[PDB]
Every structure is written in C-alpha cells, then in structure tokens.
Paper text:
The largest structure is a T = 3 particle, resolved to 4.3 Å and contains a T = 1 particle within the interior, although no fixed orientation between the shells is apparent. The T = 3 shell is 300 Å in diameter and is comprised of 12 pentamers, each surrounded by five hexamers. Hexamers are located at icosahedral three-fold axes and interact across icosahedral two-fold axes. In the T = 3 particle, there are no inter-pentamer interactions, instead each pentamer is surrounded by five hexamers. The hexamers contact both pentamers and hexamers through the CTD–CTD interactions with three alternating CArec protomers linking to T = 3 pentamers and the other three linking to T = 3 hexamers. These non-equivalent contacts are accommodated by relative shifts of adjacent CA monomers reducing the hexamer to three-fold symmetry, consistent with its location at the icosahedral three-fold axis. When the CTD–CTD interaction is with a pentamer, the intra-hexamer CTD–NTD interaction has the same structural conformation and specific hydrogen bonding arrangement as the T = 1 pentamer conformation. By contrast, when the CTD–CTD interaction is with a hexamer, the CTD shifts away from its NTD by 3.6 Å, the R143-mediated α6–α7 interaction is lost and the intra-hexamer CTD–NTD interaction has a structural conformation and hydrogen-bonding configuration that is comparable to that of the D6 hexamer. Measurements of the radial distance of the centroid for T = 3 pentamers and hexamers show that pentamers are situated at a higher radius than hexamers, 143.9 and 136.5 Å, respectively. This difference in displacement is accommodated in T = 3 hexamers by the alternating shift-up of the CTDs (3.3 Å) to interact with adjacent pentamers and shift-down (3.3 Å) to interact with adjacent hexamers.
CA forms the capsid shell surrounding the viral core that protects and transports the viral genome and also interacts with host cell factors that are necessary for trafficking, nuclear entry and proviral integration. Further, we assemble particles from [name] CArec in vitro and use single-particle cryogenic electron microscopy (cryo-EM) to determine the high-resolution structures of four different types of Fullerene shell assemblies. Our studies of [name] CArec show that an ERV retains the ability to form capsid assemblies using the same architecture as exogenous viruses. Analysis of the shell structures reveals the intra- and inter-molecular interactions that drives CA assembly into pentamers and hexamers and their association into shells that encapsidate the retroviral genome.
Residue numbers in the entry:
A (entry chain A), B (entry chain B), C (entry chain A), D (entry chain B), E (entry chain B), F (entry chain A): 1 to 4, 23 to 236
Write the structure that this text describes.
C-alpha cells in the first residue's frame, strides 16, 4: 500500500493462513468473505495486488473464473461510466493494469479514490460471483421442516441456497418470505398469523419472525 | 477502528483464531465472552466492524439470528433516545449503518462518542442472544436437576438461559435462586431447606447452597 | 501488575495456551498447578485479575466452585485476622474487591504486601480445593500390587488418590505410610524389614523406601 | 530467577513446550537433557523454582521419585560441607527451602553464590535418576546383546543405566567397555577379541569396537 | 545470499515451511509458484543456494529431474552467450558452480550482475519442468473434456502442460485456445461455435468461452 | 558464532524444529541434508557447536556413530596433512577440542579458515556416512520397471539405493549407468539406441536420458 509514495509487499504468513482458511472452508465461506472485506477496507490496494492475492490463493479454475467475472465487471463499469451524468473520465485499462499508462507497479501508485472504491466494489463482486465444486440441480419444494426442529437452523439452509439459483438481490429475497411461511410446520406457522397480514416498517421480515417464534423447542 | 481519521483494519492473525474458537467451543464459551469485550474496550469500533466480524465468523444459521436481534434492539433504544431531556438527534439508520449518510467508511469516521457505547451495549446483548446449532433453547420447567447427578453443574444451566431470556440484570440475579431448589433433587432439598434466609450481607445465596450440597451421586 | 503505578493487561496468548492446557489435562494437573504457582509468584496481582483469570479458564461449574471456596476462605481468613495477636486491620471486602473502598481497578493499585501474600495463599488454596468430573466411591483396600510391578508407579496411584477423600494434610499423610507397607508384595516388603522399626530423621519416610528398594524389577 | 532482588517468574510459553516434551519423548531424552542445563546456565535459580518446574511437568509417579532422590543427595552433600577446611555454615533445610528462614520468596532472594551450584549439581543428578513409567530399571546381566540384532544400538543401553546406578563419573566410563563384549554376540566377539588393548591416547575404545562391528543382522 | 561479501544462510524457519508445502500440495502449486519468485526477487542468489534449496526439499525422484533439466538449459543458453555482439566471456561450469574457480563460497561471492538473472530465468524453468510423482505427463490428445463434467476445470489442465512442453511464451498463449474446443464437449461446442473471431482488443478468448459455457453437468 | 570476538548461543526454536524434522524424515533425508548445509555455510561454527548440535538431535546410537566416523575422519585428515606438500601445521586435537590448547569455548574463538573448511567437510561427511534402522540385504537384479510406469520414479529408487552398498563415488555412479539401460522396459530402451553408442560431453549421462525419453506415459 501507500503511507505518505512507495509500495510495501505483504508479510508471507498472511498468504499462508489465507491459503489455509480457503483450503479448509472453501472460497465462499462466510468466514473468508468478511476476511476479504477486512483486508480490503483495511488497506489501500492496486489491481496488481489483487492479481497476486487471487493467484496466490486458489485452484487454477477459480483463478480464471475470477479473471473472467473481473473482465465482465470492467465492461459493465465502463458502460456505466460512459452513461454517467456527466460521464466519468476513467477507462477500462486503468481498471485492469494493462497498457503503457498502467503497466508498472510504480504507475499505479498515483491513482485516485474513485478508482479505489471502484476496484474494491468490483473485485468484491467478483469474489461473490464464484461457483464451487459440488453440484445438484436445485428444486425449492423438496426441503421442509420436521418435528422438534429448531426454527433458525431450518431457515438457514433456505437462506444460503437462495443466492445460488437467483442472481437478482430482490428476486431471491422475496421468495424466501413466501417459502418461510409455507415450509414452516403449522405450530410455528400458528405464531405468524398476527404477523402475516401486517408487515412492519423499520424492520426486516425474517428478523421479526425469528425474534417472534423463538420458544418452539421440544 | 479509528485513530486520532484513517480506518485501519484488523490483522489477518486477529481473525483466524476467532474463527477457530467458534468451531472449537461455540458462540458463548466463557473464553470468547472475555475475548470479545477485550477488543471492544481496547479499541473503538464502528458498526461496519461488527458487520465484518460476525459475517467472518458465524455459521449462516447463526449470522441471521445475530442480524435479527441486532435490528430488534434498535427499537427499544430509539424510544429511549427520542424522549430524553434533552432529546438527542440520532435516528434508526445511523445505528444500522445503512442509508445515504452512514454507509461508507468515510462517513463512519465522523461520529461522536455518545453513539459508540450504545452500539457496544447493544452488540454485547446481540452476541449473547445467539442459539447454538445443536438445538433450540428449552423452557424453564423443561429442565431441572437430574437424579443421581451432580448438583452444581445443573445450576450452571440456569444463568445462561437467564441472560438469554431476561433483559433486566438484577432480575436475573433474583430469578435463579428462587428457581433453584424448587424442583431440585429432593434428597438434596432436605439439606437445602433449612438454609433459607440465612444471608449475611452482599453474598451469593447459591454459594452456601453448593457449599452445603457436597454431592451424593456416583 | 505494577512496576514503578499503572495496570498492564496480560497478553492474549497466555489465556489461549492456558485454556489449551486446562482443556487437555484438567484443572488439577500437576502441570497446571505449578504453572499457576509460577505465574502467581512471578507477578503482582490484584483480586480482579484473579477474577479475569478464573472466568477466562474453565466451565461455569468450576468457576462458581472457585467463587464459593474463595468466599469461605475470606471468612476463615477474617476470623483468623480478628483472632490475631494483635488483630489485623484487614477486612473482608478488601480481600474481595466489592465496596466503595475497593470497587475499581485503580483502587486496588495501592494494596500492601500482607494482602498480596494473603490473596496468593487463599486463591492457591481455592484452586487446590476443586473437585472434577469423574466419580467413584473410594475404598482403600481394593488396590494392590502385582507381580513384576514397578514399585514407584504402584505407590503413585496411592499417592494421588490420598488427597481426595481426606482434607487434613496429616491424616492423609499418615495412612499412606501404613498402606505402603501392607499393600506391597512380600518381596518388596522384605526390603523394608530393617527400615520398618527405625524411622529416620531428616528424611521423608516414603523417600527412604523408594531409594531403598529400587532394584526389584523382572 | 533473580536479577541485579525481584523474583521474575518464567513466561507461560516457557513451560507449555516443556510439558509437551515429557509426554512426547520422556524424562531423559537427550533433547531435554540439553534443554534443561541451558536454562540452568543462562539463568540463576532458587530451589523453589525447581519445586515449580518439576511439579508443573512430571507425572505423579515421577514427581515423588524426584522429591525422594532430591532430599537423599542432601545427606551425602552435608557431610562434605560440615567437615571442610574451613567448615561452611549451611544446614539441611537451607537446601530444601523449608523452615522459618528459607520458605518465602523474600528469603531465597538473599543467598550467596556458593549455595547455588550445589543445588544445580544435585538437581541434575536428581533429574537423571528418574525411572520411566513403562517399567522399572533392570539389572546388569538381565540385558545383553540380542541375536540377529544390531550392535551399536544395544551398547547405548548401558551408558544410561551407568549414569543411573553409578555415582562416580570416571567409574562409569570404565565399567561400560569392560562389560561390553563380555556377554555380547559371539560371532561379533570373534572380530572384537583381537582389538583389546589397542588404544593409542585419549580415545573411546568403544569407537573402534563399533568401527570393527559392521553389523550382520537382517 | 550476498550483501554489500559475507554469505549469510537462510533461517531454519525459512525452510521447514518450504518442506511442508511440497508434501502438502506438490511441486507446482500456484502457492509455491508465487512463493519462490518472492524470495528470488527479494534476495540475490548464487547457484549453490539452489543446490541447497532443491536438495533440502524435493524427493529423490524429483531432485534428479531438476538436476537433469538444469544442466540441459545451459546448452541452449551458452550458444546465445557465445555468438552475442559483443561476445560475453562466461563458460559452462561458471553456470553449474563446478570446477576450480566456481566451487567455493568465497568464489561465488565474486560474480557480476549479468550472470545472476540468467541463473534465475533458467532456474524458474527448471522448477517448472518437474513431474509429479503420481504418474508421468500425458500427451495432448490423450486428455480432453469429459462427459457430464464441468467445463472450466478441464481447460485448466492445458496451460500447465503448455508451460511444461513448450518453450516460447506467446506460443503457449496461442496453442491453448486453438486446442480448446477441438475435441471438447459437443453439446457445449454448440454454444461455443458462434463465438469464433469475436475478440475486441487484448483479452482472453477463453474468458468469453467460459462466460458462455455456464455448465450443464451434474 | 563470531561477528567482529564473542560466542552467541543458538535460539531454542532451531533445535526444536530440527528435532521435529529429523524425527519425521530420518537423519538421511534430502531435506535435512541441505538444511545442514545451509546452517553450516551460513554460520561460523566451532567443533563444540557440532557437539551440541549432534547430541541435541538424535537417538544415542546415531550420536555415537557420528562420534566414531568423526574420529576416523580426524585420523584420515591428519595423515593427509602430514602427507601434504609442504605438510600442514594442524594437529588432531585442534580438530577435536580436547587438550589444554583447545579445551574451552573461549579457546576455539581464534581458529583459522583452513580449520573452518576442514571441520565443515569432515562433519558433513560424518553425517553422510550414517546408517539407519531398517535392514535388508540388497541384491541389484531384483528391482525392475513395469508397464505404464513413469520413467524417473523408476530410476529414482535405483538412484537412492546405490549409495548404500558402495562407498566409492565412482563405483556407484558407473553401475547405475549399466543398470539404467538394462532394467528399462524395451519401449523406453528403444529411445536410447541412438543415445547409447555416443556418450555426450558437457553432460551427465542420466540427465540426457531423462530429458530424452520423457514422453512415455499411458
């Protein structure tokens, strides 16, 4: 990063325990995601650092997948910058680090904050949009609760699989509301009959359910 | 964390152990209970730090419960904040870090002292209210002291559900002993019964209870 | 502790490997006992540090048991201080850290050496007087030696279990002398026939036996 | 340890590895043999330090044997100390740290140089005289070189019992080779026999013994 | 390594992790690929350092292959070195560190800059040309995309054998995509076929290939 | 070692991970051999340091074997120094550290570079000339290749066992050439028919074979 302008390479042990953690819990752990967010906002990065971090971390397949969704995000961001009002004087190759304006490590020491947040958002989104090994064609009406089942651990499996088959943030977050009230057992569904019929403002709909019907055990 | 404002992230070594401890022992070990507030009282945090720390650490089932109770405590707090004398000008989304004025790292570096401790106090209760993924939380009279079982281990199973299900602190310290020998082991209740009301000044009545009950099981 | 007056909190890794060691070998290991003695005499502690150390270490059951025997030791020490010749101007709440003379961390920075050794002896005794999981009603005349059995490893199991069922230091240390000469096999008992009949001074009675009859193998 | 007197304890990290090594290899590995005297010659110790270190580390069966031989060596030492010219004024309980003048940390900070090395020399022999908890120590002619077995491994099984059962150092270096080929493997004794008395100056005769014996087994 | 000449060795901790990583993952993980050149570009090495590092790390089967290709690259390099304009005066055994003038540590401290980078460039290719001890390296048409299998994992199995079997760098970047869909999965080839020649400027054609191929298997 | 003259003892963790590595992979690993070379050339050692390093590392059997081949190397080096032209004014006891010229640690601080390289070569050779547990009488015409066998992993087992039964460097390195061409399967032997009949200069004969016939897989 930069302090007051030079480059400082990372300490070696960070790559070691990062490789350890991704090897143990996959590239889409909730653990390593916020680890990436912490190391992202905690330092001032250039895209070549993102190249070293990505190539130093995964199998070759996930590395190239990261490269591809990075490329598509570059094109999307460039179209939105040219659609901006007024348009943004930021190209694609400044966002990728190829070309005689941005080839070297010393060239990228003099970027600006809009590029910082832009590469931050786009590489974070690139990490969010990776698949993983392990495949099964998902059908929503196959998973349901059982007797004496703890309520949040039931809805957690519905929470996690919802971001797989739906790209839109809104489309996945509306159907979990519907699948929550149906796939609940009727004794827990009995608790939501006043809550269903009046959705409250200043509040997440799932958040009201979990702190509503907590006392159903066995 | 802020300092004298730059937001420095945590170390990579700061979080791998934290991810280790939750799978090794759980979310409410006494070890991580005194580990969390050490960081909370040696540093000075913004709500996005907790957004990092919980999402990096919990399970998907636990993290949703954390987010559920986190926004739930805001409703109890903001009613206290609005009717104070003098009334303070702090709204809902200033707590949650959402909205136009609270969703960047540059924004959250510009907050006063009197917001921070409310975030700490609500986050501690949020961290305490998590359920383990083994089961749900049982009721009060669903669990009592077992037969041919030790005494002081089962009375430890009350203070946790007291901190879980009860808000007021001195209510917790008074419900437990008045639930202690009420459906306890009756052979132990013989020794326990003549000790009622024999408390000198400022001591745990449960202390002399387990002092008396030596243990007969095994 | 204090150097020349401030408070310094402990490093985090000490609690980590302490929790590791007690989890591996129990709270009454010979290992962790002298670890407690080393960290006890190696630093200048206040009772609130003992609270953090105890609560940061065990299951809830052992923590409250520690609290109880701590309380009983406070009462015993207070009775002996009032029985002292002349009596000692040291109360109970100075030894416990509750009350407006001794509530805060900064209040306990100005104690004196008699309180230091008093809290040292009494918390050490509190750790010595803990039980553990694992129960069996002990009967002394059930364990005995066998053929080709190594002599010190035979008497070690008699050494360790002797402090369980007897609180008095003298009563447990006299009966092991008797059980040593009887539960030995006659070929090793043959070696002690000059040693039995004249107990030597300046010497422990078991110590003479072990460096007497070492050469009985097989 | 003392310094320029304050008694600073060891680190917590100083002892966990020490507890690791005894269960990992034993009490008289060559590794901990050179580990112990390194601390003993880089620091300056009181007898209560050894009371800490042994009780933190050994088994209950080992610790009693250590305490047994520790007081046993005092009887051989104090006869040498009383009849010296000039006679030194150091008694029994000054060695053991017991009694009114030697049982506090404030007391043991007030000792001269000429006590310390005697404690070190007696403690090294005490640490050497421990028996492993697998069995007892066999006799001399109970063990000899096995048939179809390597040569130089079994001759290593003599120097340990020499240091165990013999006090005088140059007696140990002369008993071993005069016990070496006396009931060794007789086919190897054919090659060994014409090498007697062929030692030039200041070398191990056993060196040329294992030089000659190439190894026939397997 | 040299400095401002004394040859300082590496740390002991520098190499145990390196020995750990090869048995943990292999000789050409991406992790050690970016680990090696970090040392190679943060330090300045002589050929005897690589003699240390490979022999300390590989298997006996791997180390001989490394030594085999290491001397093999010298023949291609020295023909370039002899016919240059101006011709440089560097011979064979100056590369290999053998002979009267290059086989001591005092000798190799006396070399110029323009030798060093050739050693680095040849050693990287030498480290890349190693075969794993599971099997040998297969041919080109022995392996293609499998049936009911993911797409972008199997195309990763081409760039490695490209770097293995091909010397010229831009030949590698052009052989792979012209071998990509040639015996790939034909149902995927239906979507792949209309994308030929649609490359704007300076991008991976394989990127849009795996962009198109979503994945049908499983 | 020495910097500008004192002695500095090693850090304790170096002995720890050295004992770890030799315990895992034996004293004749390719790993630990170059570790010894790195720590050898990386520092300025005295023979007493070699004593501490050797005694701190192995079983007693390997330690005494090291001592013996050390002794024989002293005698060989002394005969060659007296056979030198002019002879070398370096004795045996300067090379061993016994005697009133070389008894102490402070005495060995003032050696010279010929002694440095002499003790380096001779202790390295002492480590090379150790046997190990695990015995089997070797016969060369028992091991051969199979179908689809990877060629370098076949010859690696012939490479490693060749230094066991032959002490001469030339005698073992000539017979592996013969056993290479015979014990190869005829399809790989088919590749060497132009290479057999003209051995190339500036090249190792095995090195040409491995980079000749690499493409025989299956």
């Amino acid at each position: 990063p930069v302090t007051l302008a030079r480059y400082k390479s990372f300490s070696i042990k960070m790559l070691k325990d990062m490789k350890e953690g991704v090897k143990q819990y996959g590239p889409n752990s909730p653990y390593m995601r916020t680890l990436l967010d912490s190391i992202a906002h905690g330092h001032r990065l250039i895209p070549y650092d993102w190249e070293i971090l990505a190539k130093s971390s995964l199998s070759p397949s996930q590395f190239l997948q990261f490269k591809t969704w990075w490329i598509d995000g570059v094109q999307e961001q460039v179209r939105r910058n040219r659609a901006a009002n007024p348009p943004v004087n930021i190209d694609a190759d400044q966002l990728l680090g190829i070309g005689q304006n941005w080839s070297t490590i010393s060239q990228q020491a003099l970027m600006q904050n809009e590029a910082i947040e832009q590469v931050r958002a786009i590489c974070l989104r690139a990490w969010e949009k990776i698949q993983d090994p392990g495949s099964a064609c998902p059908s929503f009406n196959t998973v349901r609760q059982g007797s004496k089942e703890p309520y949040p651990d039931f809805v957690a499996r519905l929470q996690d699989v919802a971001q797989k088959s739906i790209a839109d943030e809104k489309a996945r977050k509306v159907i979990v509301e519907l699948m929550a009230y149906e796939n609940a057992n009727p004794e827990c569904q009995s608790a939501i009959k006043p809550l269903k019929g009046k959705v409250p403002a200043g509040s997440d709909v799932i958040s009201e359910y979990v702190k509503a019907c907590d006392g159903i055990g066995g």
